[PDB]
Design a protein around this motif. Structure first.
Motif, PDB file in Angstrom:
ATOM      1  N   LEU A 250       0.872  -1.208   0.000  1.00 19.34           N
ATOM      2  CA  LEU A 250       0.000   0.000   0.000  1.00 19.34           C
ATOM      3  C   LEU A 250       0.895   1.240   0.000  1.00 19.34           C
ATOM      4  CD1 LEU A 250      -2.899  -1.171   2.342  1.00 19.34           C
ATOM      5  CD2 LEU A 250      -2.966  -0.863  -0.121  1.00 19.34           C
ATOM      6  N   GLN A 251       1.966   1.209   0.779  1.00 20.47           N
ATOM      7  CA  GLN A 251       2.952   2.313   0.825  1.00 20.47           C
ATOM      8  C   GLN A 251       3.510   2.540  -0.581  1.00 20.47           C
ATOM      9  OE1 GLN A 251       5.384   0.604   3.928  1.00 20.47           O
ATOM     10  NE2 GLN A 251       4.906   2.313   5.274  1.00 20.47           N
ATOM     11  N   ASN A 252       3.978   1.488  -1.245  1.00 20.10           N
ATOM     12  CA  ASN A 252       4.607   1.631  -2.589  1.00 20.10           C
ATOM     13  C   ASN A 252       3.533   2.061  -3.599  1.00 20.10           C
ATOM     14  OD1 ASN A 252       7.690   0.950  -2.807  1.00 20.10           O
ATOM     15  ND2 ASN A 252       6.820  -0.488  -1.314  1.00 20.10           N
ATOM     16  N   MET A 253       2.302   1.616  -3.410  1.00 18.60           N
ATOM     17  CA  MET A 253       1.194   1.959  -4.324  1.00 18.60           C
ATOM     18  C   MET A 253       0.946   3.481  -4.284  1.00 18.60           C
ATOM     19  SD  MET A 253      -2.718   0.631  -4.314  1.00 18.60           S
ATOM     20  CE  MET A 253      -2.197  -1.073  -4.267  1.00 18.60           C
ATOM     21  N   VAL A 254       0.787   4.049  -3.087  1.00 17.96           N
ATOM     22  CA  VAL A 254       0.500   5.506  -2.937  1.00 17.96           C
ATOM     23  C   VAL A 254       1.740   6.304  -3.354  1.00 17.96           C
ATOM     24  CG1 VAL A 254      -0.125   7.337  -1.289  1.00 17.96           C
ATOM     25  CG2 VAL A 254      -1.301   5.132  -1.246  1.00 17.96           C
ATOM     26  N   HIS A 255       2.931   5.780  -3.042  1.00 12.49           N
ATOM     27  CA  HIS A 255       4.221   6.362  -3.486  1.00 12.49           C
ATOM     28  C   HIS A 255       4.257   6.413  -5.031  1.00 12.49           C
ATOM     29  CE1 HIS A 255       8.237   7.714  -3.368  1.00 12.49           C
ATOM     30  NE2 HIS A 255       8.827   6.521  -3.620  1.00 12.49           N
ATOM     31  N   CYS A 256       3.918   5.313  -5.724  1.00 14.01           N
ATOM     32  CA  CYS A 256       3.808   5.240  -7.213  1.00 14.01           C
ATOM     33  C   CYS A 256       2.776   6.263  -7.705  1.00 14.01           C
ATOM     34  CB  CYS A 256       3.435   3.848  -7.719  1.00 14.01           C
ATOM     35  SG  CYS A 256       4.714   2.577  -7.478  1.00 14.01           S
ATOM     36  N   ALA A 257       1.637   6.372  -7.026  1.00 13.92           N
ATOM     37  CA  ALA A 257       0.594   7.359  -7.383  1.00 13.92           C
ATOM     38  C   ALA A 257       1.168   8.775  -7.274  1.00 13.92           C
ATOM     39  CB  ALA A 257      -0.618   7.158  -6.505  1.00 13.92           C
ATOM     40  N   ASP A 258       1.934   9.024  -6.221  1.00 15.76           N
ATOM     41  CA  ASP A 258       2.556  10.341  -5.934  1.00 15.76           C
ATOM     42  C   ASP A 258       3.566  10.678  -7.040  1.00 15.76           C
ATOM     43  OD1 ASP A 258       2.627  12.598  -4.317  1.00 15.76           O
ATOM     44  OD2 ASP A 258       4.211  11.822  -3.008  1.00 15.76           O
ATOM     45  N   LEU A 259       4.320   9.683  -7.517  1.00 18.30           N
ATOM     46  CA  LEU A 259       5.358   9.845  -8.572  1.00 18.30           C
ATOM     47  C   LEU A 259       4.804   9.363  -9.921  1.00 18.30           C
ATOM     48  CD1 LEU A 259       8.492   8.655  -6.546  1.00 18.30           C
ATOM     49  CD2 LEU A 259       7.498  10.911  -6.744  1.00 18.30           C
TER      50      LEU A 259
ATOM     51  N   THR B 120       9.887  -1.803 -10.941  1.00 19.64           N
ATOM     52  CA  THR B 120       9.691  -2.791  -9.838  1.00 19.64           C
ATOM     53  C   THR B 120       8.196  -3.012  -9.582  1.00 19.64           C
ATOM     54  OG1 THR B 120      11.686  -1.870  -8.930  1.00 19.64           O
ATOM     55  CG2 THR B 120      10.492  -3.459  -7.544  1.00 19.64           C
ATOM     56  N   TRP B 121       7.384  -1.954  -9.572  1.00 21.19           N
ATOM     57  CA  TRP B 121       5.903  -2.100  -9.470  1.00 21.19           C
ATOM     58  C   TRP B 121       5.434  -3.013 -10.609  1.00 21.19           C
ATOM     59  CZ3 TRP B 121       2.501  -1.564  -5.721  1.00 21.19           C
ATOM     60  CH2 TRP B 121       1.154  -1.719  -6.036  1.00 21.19           C
TER      61      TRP B 121
END
Ligand SMILES: COc1ccc(C2=NNC(=O)C2(C)C)cc1OC1CCCC1
Ligand SMILES: [Mg+2]
Ligand SMILES: [Zn+2]
Length: 330
Positions: A229-238, A302-303
């Motif tokens: 979830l952290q990497n998901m919102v981080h990906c959304a942010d970037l 990586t995602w």
């Protein structure tokens, strides 16, 4: 009557793209009267049936969304309600990925989306480092640690205490404790100082990836569930460089406006001008290529591995946008 204005009709037609990467979020901000976060969050809550599941009175939801949107600064070019709306809608599309179908609980979905909506609230349009170097009250409050991200969380939660703004009034204490921990873990992970550790852990998770029958990701502990979830919102942010070029260029104009304004405030005060904040000494194009090469592409690559091959068109767009910026380096 009980029918919509024609402006409200054009808005509803644009919101039909809400499940698609490349939503006309700037046009939605124009049509909503600068209410993109409120209308997009409302649409998403209806679509995912979150009002019924969590017994959220619709009047309370709209009051909290408008209060939250109002605490984004209209005078900040990038870190505003439109960026918040964009990250919410992008997180929404990432949650719907085939490789994550039925993986996450309703509470986790709520945490990711709520986190996305509050993740930059009351952003003053300058960096953590600027707030630390100027001895700002915020830097003092948070002991120079994840200053903005602590503040966004504290404001997001505090606004629930305003008149008719408690959207979690009907959740149990257990649901509220769990939602709170997940939202804090997600927003603290938007601090770019955490990017390398987050990406290391996402890479570790791709290497040790287990799937169920039907090929969906297995996550059987909190630590793994929250990291995704952290990497998901981080990906959304970037996610700006992964969008159609007309959207990406608008985000680039806006982040560069914000950065140059920080540089002007630093030059005025005789402070050292922060990286890529000097409008007199800046390569917009080379900065975007560097951003893609060192930060955005490694994260999205990586995602894309984690959810293979759900993110292939997003990665293709990123690589196309990268070659476009490279070809405009003078
Ligand atoms: C659309 O270009 C960008 C979009 C977002 C960001 C960021 N997000 N928040 C952050 O903490 C950073 C990493 C600064 C950075 C972007 O370009 C960089 C390259 C040119 C200026 C900064
Ligand atoms: Mg942020
Ligand atoms: Zn952000």
């Amino acid at each position: 009557f009980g029918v919509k204005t024609e402006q409200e009709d054009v808005l509803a037609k644009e919101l039909e793209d809400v499940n698609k990467w490349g939503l006309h979020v700037f046009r939605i901000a124009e049509l909503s009267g600068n209410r993109p976060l409120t209308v997009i969050m409302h649409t998403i809550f209806q679509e995912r049936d979150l009002l019924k599941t969590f017994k959220i009175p619709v009047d309370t939801l709209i009051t909290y969304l408008m209060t939250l949107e109002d605490h984004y600064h209209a005078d900040v070019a990038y870190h505003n309600n439109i960026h918040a709306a964009d990250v919410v809608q992008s997180t929404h599309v990432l949650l719907s990925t085939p490789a994550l179908e039925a993986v996450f609980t309703d509470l986790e979905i709520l945490a990711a989306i709520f986190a996305s909506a509050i993740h930059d609230v009351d952003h003053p349009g300058v960096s953590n480092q600027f707030l630390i170097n100027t001895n700002s009250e915020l830097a003092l409050m948070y002991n120079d640690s994840s200053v903005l991200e602590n503040h966004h969380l504290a404001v997001g939660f505090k606004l629930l205490q305003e008149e008719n703004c408690d959207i979690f009034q009907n959740l149990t204490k257990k649901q509220r404790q769990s939602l709170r921990k997940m939202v804090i873990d997600i927003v603290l992970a938007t601090d770019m100082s955490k990017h390398m550790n987050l990406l290391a852990d996402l890479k570790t998770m791709v290497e040790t990836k287990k799937v169920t029958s039907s090929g969906v990701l297995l996550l059987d502990n909190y630590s793994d569930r929250i990291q995704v979830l952290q990497n998901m919102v981080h990906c959304a942010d970037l996610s700006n460089p992964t969008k159609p070029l007309q959207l990406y260029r608008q985000w680039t104009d806006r982040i560069m406006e914000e950065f140059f304004r920080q540089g002007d405030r630093e030059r005025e005060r005789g402070m050292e001008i922060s990286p890529m904040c000097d409008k007199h000494n800046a390569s917009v194009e080379k900065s975007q290529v560097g951003f893609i090469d060192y930060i955005v592409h490694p994260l999205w690559e990586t995602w894309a591995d984690l959810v293979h091959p759900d993110a292939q068109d997003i990665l293709d767009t990123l690589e196309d946008n990268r070659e476009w910026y490279q070809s405009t380096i003078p």
